[PDB]
């Protein structure tokens, strides 16, 4: 799966912001507009047994340039919530369900 970081009209959003993937599927998060961005998973809204420090970017690392990417594979089934650190109060939050 690929998820765009920012909307083309400048909206500070993941596109799509709610998606479904298969267990073991790789998600590539790609800079699209309005960067910098990063991705961080919420430690309270991931399945049990998942270590959020292994699947999140470090809070202070940023994707700064057009086309930059961050990829992560999710295996544990359930719902994961994630957000972009610099834009978290601006509404840049998303959800992925692993089936
Ligand atoms: Cu952002």
Q: Which CATH number fits the domain that encloses residue 93? A: 2.60.40.420
28-40 burial by CB neighbour count: b if 16+ within 10 A, else e?
Answer: ebbbbbbbbbbbb
- The residue from 29, 80, 87, 98 that is catalytic is 87
Look-up of token digits 């991931």: 46
CA distances to 26, 34, 48, 90 from 55, in Å: 11, 23, 14, 22
Q: Does the annotation mark 29 as catalytic?
A: no
The resolution in Å comes to 1.8
Question: What domain range is 13 assigned to?
Answer: 1-99
Selecting among 4, 37, 39, 83, the annotated active-site residue is 37
β partners of residue 19: 96
Active-site residue 37, yes or no?
A: yes
Q: Please give the C-alpha separations between residue 6 and each of 31, 41, 63, in angstroms, as whole numbers.
A: 7, 17, 12
Q: Round to whole Å and give the CA distance between 57 and 63.
A: 10
Q: State the Cα–Cα distance between residues 51 and 67, nearest whole angstrom.
A: 27
* Total of domains in the chain: 1
């Amino acid at each position: 799966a690929e998820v765009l970081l920012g909307s083309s009209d400048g909206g500070l959003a993941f596109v799509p912001s709610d998606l479904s993937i298969a267990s073991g599927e790789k998600i590539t998060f790609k800079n699209n507009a309005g960067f910098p961005h990063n991705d961080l998973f919420d430690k309270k809204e991931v399945p049990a047994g998942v270590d959020v420090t292994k699947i999140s970017m470090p809070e202070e690392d940023l994707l700064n340039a057009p086309g930059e990417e961050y990829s992560v594979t999710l295996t544990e089934k359930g719902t994961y919530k994630f957000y972009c650190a610099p834009h978290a109060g601006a509404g840049m939050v998303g959800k992925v369900t692993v089936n």
